[PDB]
Structures are given as structure tokens and as C-alpha cells.
Scaffold this active site. Structure first.
Site, PDB file in Angstrom:
ATOM      1  N   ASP A 187      -6.475   6.198  -4.842  1.00  0.00           N
ATOM      2  CA  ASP A 187      -5.960   4.872  -4.944  1.00  0.00           C
ATOM      3  C   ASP A 187      -6.093   4.460  -6.467  1.00  0.00           C
ATOM      4  O   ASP A 187      -6.389   5.030  -7.388  1.00  0.00           O
ATOM      5  CB  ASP A 187      -6.983   3.874  -3.974  1.00  0.00           C
ATOM      6  CG  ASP A 187      -8.000   3.657  -4.395  1.00  0.00           C
ATOM      7  OD1 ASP A 187      -8.687   4.154  -5.653  1.00  0.00           O
ATOM      8  OD2 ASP A 187      -8.936   2.988  -3.665  1.00  0.00           O
TER       9      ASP A 187
ATOM     10  N   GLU B 259       0.871  -1.210  -0.071  1.00  0.00           N
ATOM     11  CA  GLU B 259       0.027   0.127   0.062  1.00  0.00           C
ATOM     12  C   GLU B 259       0.942   1.180   0.034  1.00  0.00           C
ATOM     13  O   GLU B 259       0.136   2.325  -0.357  1.00  0.00           O
ATOM     14  CB  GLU B 259      -0.855  -0.049   1.132  1.00  0.00           C
ATOM     15  CG  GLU B 259      -2.062  -1.115   1.238  1.00  0.00           C
ATOM     16  CD  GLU B 259      -2.967  -0.838   0.168  1.00  0.00           C
ATOM     17  OE1 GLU B 259      -3.261   0.188  -0.565  1.00  0.00           O
ATOM     18  OE2 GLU B 259      -3.568  -1.969  -0.032  1.00  0.00           O
TER      19      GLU B 259
END
Ligand SMILES: Cc1cccc(I)c1
Ligand SMILES: [Cl-]
Length: 162
Positions: free
Chosen positions: A20, A11
Site C-alpha cells: 500500500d 483503493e
């Protein structure tokens, strides 16, 4: 290696609101804020999550605190889910990390279509499960991360993260 190190690799860490891979406002170590296209909506979610007026920016300690909460929420969601818990409890600790990783990324609803993969994993048919896991939107849209997670399920080692 452990689940925190694994997801931190997958991440990253960003202290200002970002989008994202799906285009959704996110912060920290992959903490989804909202699917709304409104940056103000994302900022409200952030302030609610942190407990102060952040105007889109957090500290590393805050990012790590949110991350711990998010990992724990993924684990407890698995344990409360009648489909996921039996498979999770059948796995060794390394493969359980791969399961948490998927739930962190996609949620319980995002893994609902993985019924056949779940069966193969419970049967410990690792190569078969790995082939099945790759037949997915998940693999096609985030192939390098999916390949690491799938290798973890296939081998029960951390080799893809070393
Ligand atoms: C393949 C998969 C994904 C999420 C959770 C489990 I248990 C297994
Ligand atoms: Cl990827």
C-alpha cells in the site's frame, strides 16, 4: 455512487499481494494484511482470511467478499465508538460515506486526532471542517484521495468521484 463504488475507486483492485501507500502488504480492494515486513507473515494472514492456501493470489470474487467484510467492519466500528457515532448519525448519507472511507483507510485509531474536525462536521460548518481536515498527515501523504473525501464532506455531493 455508494460506499463500495467510492472505495473501489480510491483503493483499486489487485489480485496479488502488493504494498500500500505506506509500504504494507495488502491485497484485493485495499485489504491490509500486515504491517510486518515479512512476506510470509502476509501470506499467512491471507490464507487465514480466505480459508485456503492462496500463495499470495486471490480471485475477484474473493477480493469482493473481503471488501464487503471490511466495509461492514468500518461501519460497525463507527457505530460502537462513542466519539464517532454521534457525528456519524448527524450526517447525511453521502457524508457518511466520506466518514466510512476515512475509517477504512486509517482505522479508528488513525482518526483519533480528528476531534476538532469531528466537532466542525457535527456543527455542519462544512468549509471550516474541510480546511481543518486538510491540516493532517493524511492529506499530505495521500492528497488526491484526501481531496476527494474532503470535497465529499464539504459539499455532500459525489462531484469529486464523477
Ligand atoms: C472526519 C471523520 C473521520 C472518520 C469518521 C468520522 I464520523 C469523521
Ligand atoms: Cl492520493
Amino acid at each position: 455512487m455508494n460506499i463500495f463504488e467510492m472505495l473501489r475507486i480510491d483503493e483499486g483492485l489487485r489480485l496479488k499481494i502488493y504494498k500500500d501507500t505506506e509500504g504494507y502488504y495488502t491485497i484485493g480492494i485495499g485489504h491490509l494484511l500486515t504491517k510486518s515486513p515479512s512476506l510470509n507473515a502476509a501470506k499467512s494472514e491471507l490464507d487465514k482470511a480466505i480459508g485456503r492456501n492462496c500463495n499470495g493470489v486471490i480471485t475477484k470474487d474473493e477480493a469482493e467478499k473481503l471488501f464487503n467484510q471490511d466495509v461492514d467492519a468500518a461501519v460497525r466500528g463507527i457505530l460502537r465508538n462513542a466519539k464517532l457515532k454521534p457525528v456519524y448519525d448527524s450526517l447525511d448519507a453521502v457524508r457518511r460515506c466520506a466518514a466510512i472511507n476515512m475509517v477504512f483507510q486509517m482505522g479508528e485509531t488513525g482518526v483519533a486526532g480528528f476531534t476538532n474536525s469531528l466537532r466542525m462536521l457535527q456543527q455542519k460548518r462544512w468549509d471550516e471542517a474541510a480546511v481543518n481536515l486538510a491540516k493532517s498527515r493524511w492529506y499530505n501523504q495521500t492528497p488526491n484521495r484526501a481531496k476527494r473525501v474532503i470535497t465529499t464532506f464539504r459539499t455532500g455531493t459525489w462531484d469529486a468521484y464523477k
